[PDB]
UniProtKB/Swiss-Prot annotation, chain A:
Gene Ontology terms, MF aspect: kynurenine-oxoglutarate transaminase activity; pyridoxal phosphate binding; succinyldiaminopimelate transaminase activity
Entry-annotated residues carrying N6-(pyridoxal phosphate)lysine: K232
Protein name listed in UniProt: Probable N-succinyldiaminopimelate aminotransferase DapC
Keyword set, alphabetical order: Amino-acid biosynthesis, Aminotransferase, Cytoplasm, Lysine biosynthesis, Pyridoxal phosphate, Transferase
Amino acid sequence: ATVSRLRPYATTVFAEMSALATRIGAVNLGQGFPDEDGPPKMLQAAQDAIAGGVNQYPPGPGSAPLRRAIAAQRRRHFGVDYDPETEVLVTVGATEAIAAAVLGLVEPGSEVLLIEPFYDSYSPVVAMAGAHRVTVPLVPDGRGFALDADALRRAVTPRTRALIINSPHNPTGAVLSATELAAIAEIAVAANLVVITDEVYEHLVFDHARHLPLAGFDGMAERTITISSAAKMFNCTGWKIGWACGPAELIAGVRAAKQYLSYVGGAPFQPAVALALDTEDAWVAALRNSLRARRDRLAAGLTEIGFAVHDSYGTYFLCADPRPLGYDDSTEFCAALPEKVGVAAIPMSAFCDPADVWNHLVRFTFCKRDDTLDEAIRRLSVLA
Amino acid sequence: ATVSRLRPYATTVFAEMSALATRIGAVNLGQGFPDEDGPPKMLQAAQDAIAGGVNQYPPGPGSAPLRRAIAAQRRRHFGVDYDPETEVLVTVGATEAIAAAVLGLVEPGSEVLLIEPFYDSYSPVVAMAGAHRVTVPLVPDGRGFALDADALRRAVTPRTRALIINSPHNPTGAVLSATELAAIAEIAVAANLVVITDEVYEHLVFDHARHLPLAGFDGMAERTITISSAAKMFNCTGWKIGWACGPAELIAGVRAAKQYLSYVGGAPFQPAVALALDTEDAWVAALRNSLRARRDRLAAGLTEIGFAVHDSYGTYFLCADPRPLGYDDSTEFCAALPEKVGVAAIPMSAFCDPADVWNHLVRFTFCKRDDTLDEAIRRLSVLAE
Ligand SMILES: [Cl-]
Ligand SMILES: [Cl-]
Ligand code: NA
């Protein structure tokens, strides 16, 4: 039983799916997390931190070293230069930075624009704030997807306070082009919006796609809360070391909510993640490479089975269409999948506003070991 | 910088104090966390968990061993039986349990009763849910503090929907008596309240005080969310393994909000805390005896200096009054203390509704290393004139 505005979101298919798969013994290609660990020296650092007494509340905004390391990484990678003392806030994952940014910054009654299909937490967070979700779908292009900038512009109203942008994009694996980003900036500037970007896949762009933080576009620095995380970057989704970066005033509204949601967390992980950020670029590049190969590996397998596979330019997900196999209901496809076939995936319906080809798509995860991907493919092959 | 309703809460003094004292080398008796670590075997199990790959999202409601261990501990200590599958939710500390329980169960426009002085997160969490706090103060009872059940009853209106109780109590160190708990129960039932109880100091009761979980009282099991944490119980406030326990439908409401605030956290700590709950009762008992001895030392030292020290029956906090020393402004006293005296503490004004004893009290922490605690007392001794 839950408050009225959270009722639509009281359960997710994500948990019903991972629990089902877990003791069907179904290969889980629905999971939002990796099989493999982060950098060995990062794991060791976290172990040494516990052993060395780093087990109490860290400073409210995050340890100084971790805040410096985040600013140093954003500067190193992208040339955006944040002040670690006032413009960087460590959070309990990107998940908390998202929740706190909306609760801290968006007044009840305001509209928040979402790009559809959207990550699972955006709508309920907007609803928790008492704000109104307005969704603008991506459009196919032809094997991938693209922003429809005119559609986004039309969606803005005087009630729009904020826009949440997620690139590289979960679930489609789209990577917003500079042109798309420039169009988003023009709109955000013209309407005087706050923009919250969700960049947790910043390290995962494939095939000459390039991650270009929106905060770097004209007019954007002063109005963007940029969110990312160690979760996927360093394969430590269970550590929940994320961060929001932006203008001190906006970071203060984020901190204003955040400090009462968790206060702080992840004490021994903060020095370990700071170390990873400072030192593990080469490991991250090898991760990205390993995932590009696994993407190709899964795509090739789905394709040989007879799925119509869409391009993925980043993240560790790709979307595929089972219509060529004879499966026209993808929510029912995925529902039946573990018991019929012994694989789990997520239907695209999970990421879409309840009232285009979207309803047919399935999201598959490829951050699994080689062998597991292969086994998934073998199991799925019975559909042919 | 911030939405209207959180503006009063945008900054805490718990921030400006921590940092003032940290880097002028003032002994910090304002802190809300211990100097020392939890059970060695719990620390090692967390390190082992990291080394063993336990680094990814745990299950949405907490790992099964942890939920089982919470239910086993609540049974073992209180004889209360929760179903670990449906009636136990692991959260990101008690703090997130509180936030998610209010956001998940309390409708905008509701009144939420709070007992003043109150923990820092209650008021802003109520505001974030679009609800209205109604505050009822404790009253002096000799050297200690008491619930005024009549004031509490009178504070209920047709729009009251929830009540947050914290016992053992931060900041006074009061521990609600069965008589007080039973009076809360009557009120909650009569007004059909959801009650959230913050029991993070469940292990820290002293002398003849007893911790009696409110969920145990008449008509309460069906309307109560009981919250606690490994934070203080096992000296790991940075690990944020908290939990909420209660009827399946209320817990689902907590989970509904919680799963979008953090989703989950603390992966390698969950097996470690499960272990500590299952096996480290002896260590927790010694910790409690150890903190009783540090309380008595602090109280004796403040008293000898010339503070009027109040009774404390639990938590690792005690309250004292510096008026007999000649300090009639305790917010100012605390502001100047780190520079003047080399010690930091929190004034009671930081726990009161910004709308008489309270304004003069100062909360001191005694979960300090013994010698650190002695140094603080030593430092405070300059105030004897
Ligand atoms: Cl371009
Ligand atoms: Cl009694
Ligand atoms: Na506008």
